[PDB]
């Protein structure tokens, strides 16, 4: 059940504006090309539309570098104090784009090194000292509760996604990942929000640490075994559930996956819109990973209903 390319044409966006707004534009274009590549839809959608999309991703990238500070961190403006969140988000989008356009390793691994050497506390927590202006671009992190866990998980996920490129350049990186994992592991069982259970769940699963009681908490947090939701904005629950799908695929829990993909398909969420950045990136990252790892997986006999009338 690949999402039809025709439904995603609005995600091909010309990025523009300052260090936050440029990433708001680059997000949908990068994840749309990622997803149309993995689902092999360019032949039907228009092979010729892919080159234009890549040009816009290159424009995004070149524009974002105007906001790269001497430290290798990012902020909205060159004279604004650097954002831990924005820098880690840049690492997340550039890491995923590396097969689409040429990403400078100096830029990627510079931002990673800065996050580890400037913004990680001795207990493994990542701290934000200069929050982004566009609070709507950070999804479910905008919630006040479980900030240390949710941001440590967000940053750890960016480090883990950059590790292949940056491990051989940043010798502090494996130790930073271990310390961040230690904090998440030590505090996971006390989490109350499904959003944090999901994003900290994916972060731990990437390291093989979502196990035993922590794995049971992750799985039993899902409603009807198909979604991770809190009682607020639906965009946050689409995001939460995308992180939960990424965790399930890391766990190789292939039998738990199909009901979660069905629930995501039934939201008919095609990305874009105010405050859409994290949901757009995460839903298409998670569905692309699903398409790669366990496409059309079937966990029971879907020829027939589960009814067994015995008259």
């Amino acid at each position, epitope marked *: 059940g690949a999402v039809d390319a025709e439904r995603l044409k609005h995600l091909i966006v010309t990025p523009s504006g300052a260090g936050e707004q440029n990433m708001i534009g680059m997000t949908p274009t990068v994840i749309a090309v990622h997803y149309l590549d993995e689902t092999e839809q360019w032949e039907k959608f228009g092979l010729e539309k892919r080159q234009g999309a890549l040009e816009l991703i290159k424009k995004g990238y070149t524009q974002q570098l105007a906001f790269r500070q001497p430290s290798s961190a990012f902020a909205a403006f060159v004279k604004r104090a650097p954002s831990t969140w924005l820098t880690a988000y840049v690492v997340k989008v550039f890491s995923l784009a590396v097969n689409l356009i040429a990403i400078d390793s100096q830029v990627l691994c510079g931002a990673v090194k800065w996050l580890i050497l400037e913004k990680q506390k001795p207990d493994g927590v990542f701290q934000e000292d200069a929050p982004v202006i566009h609070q709507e671009m950070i999804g479910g992190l905008r919630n006040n509760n479980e900030k240390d866990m949710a941001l440590t998980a967000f940053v750890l996920i960016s480090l883990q996604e950059a590790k292949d490129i940056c491990e051989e350049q940043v010798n502090s990186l494996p130790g930073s990942i271990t310390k961040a994992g230690d904090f998440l592991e030590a505090n996971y069982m006390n989490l109350q929000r499904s959003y944090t259970v999901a994003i900290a769940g994916y972060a731990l699963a990437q390291m093989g640490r979502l196990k035993g009681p922590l794995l049971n908490k992750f799985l039993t947090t899902a409603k009807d075994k198909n979604r991770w939701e809190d009682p607020g904005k639906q965009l946050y629950n689409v995001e939460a559930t995308s992180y939960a799908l990424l965790a399930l695929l890391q766990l190789k829990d292939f039998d738990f996956v199909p009901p979660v993909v069905r629930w995501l398909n039934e939201q008919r969420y095609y990305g874009g819109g105010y405050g859409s950045t994290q949901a757009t990136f995460m839903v298409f990252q998670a569905l692309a990973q699903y398409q790669k790892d366990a496409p*059309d997986h*079937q*966990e*029971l006999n*879907l*020829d027939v209903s589960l009814q*067994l009338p015995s008259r």
Partner: antibody
Framework: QVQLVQSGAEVKKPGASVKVSCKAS????????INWVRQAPGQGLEWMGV????????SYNQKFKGRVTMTVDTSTSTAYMELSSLRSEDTAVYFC????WGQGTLVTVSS | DVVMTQSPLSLPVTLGQPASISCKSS???????????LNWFQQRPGQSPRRLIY???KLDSGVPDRFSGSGSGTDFTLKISRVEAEDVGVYYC?????????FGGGTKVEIKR
């Protein structure tokens, strides 16, 4: 890949009973309901019933109620269909489907 | 019981050309669990059905994307965008919503000459 291997062809007298087996491989046996369907020579298909190998629960076509029994042995991944009081019109290929189909078992009912 | 009606009875096809088959149910196949249990398979003479489509439009694993299924309520269609030689055989639809489960009478896809 997944295979369902069914027992060989049977010749039965009218009034006799037949028990067909279906050995499954290549998937988690208890996760998938097992449909039994028959096809008379040159004809279409008729659903016999289903078993849930997890619970043992069964549902039958009421046309065969009292004459059809479906079981599983989970420790050999085998499903069985027993049909009794056999009639000439019971001559058919019997299939298991879970949802992949077995090769079928011909049951010929004749004196 | 639910009646499944297929059309046409025989469909002569040209290699490389499209094919379309109809399946109509005597009532809606939307289940109370929200899924529509409409299935297609192919049976080539002397053989075990090859599962093609389930839940109206979902291709089974490995089934080539020249196959597609569509429809709702009571009107379903199987399409092959460009017919290949391995696509000949009898096509069945069947429904897994209502009891008993019921099959269409089959559409024979054969090589036109």
């Amino acid at each position: 890949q997944v295979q369902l291997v069914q027992s060989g062809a049977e010749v039965k007298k009218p009034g006799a009973s037949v028990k067909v087996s279906c050995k499954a491989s290549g998937y988690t046996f208890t996760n998938y309901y097992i449909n039994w369907v028959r096809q008379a020579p040159g004809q279409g298909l008729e659903w016999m019933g289903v078993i849930n190998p997890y619970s043992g629960g069964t549902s039958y076509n009421q046309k065969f109620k009292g004459r059809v029994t479906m079981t599983v042995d989970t420790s050999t991944s085998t499903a069985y269909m027993e049909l009794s009081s056999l009639r000439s019109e019971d001559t058919a290929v019997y299939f298991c489907s879970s949802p992949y189909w077995g090769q079928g078992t011909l049951v010929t009912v004749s004196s | 019981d639910v009646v499944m009606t297929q059309s046409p009875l025989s469909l002569p096809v040209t290699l490389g050309q499209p094919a379309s088959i109809s399946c109509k149910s005597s009532q809606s196949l939307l289940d109370s669990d929200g899924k529509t249990y409409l299935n297609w398979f192919q049976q080539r003479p002397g053989q075990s059905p090859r599962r093609l489509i389930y839940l109206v439009s979902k291709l089974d694993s490995g089934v080539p994307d020249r196959f597609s299924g569509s429809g709702s309520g009571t009107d379903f269609t199987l399409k092959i965008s460009r017919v290949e030689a391995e696509d000949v055989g009898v096509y069945y639809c069947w429904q897994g919503t209502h009891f008993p489960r019921t099959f269409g009478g089959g559409t024979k896809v054969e090589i036109k000459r």
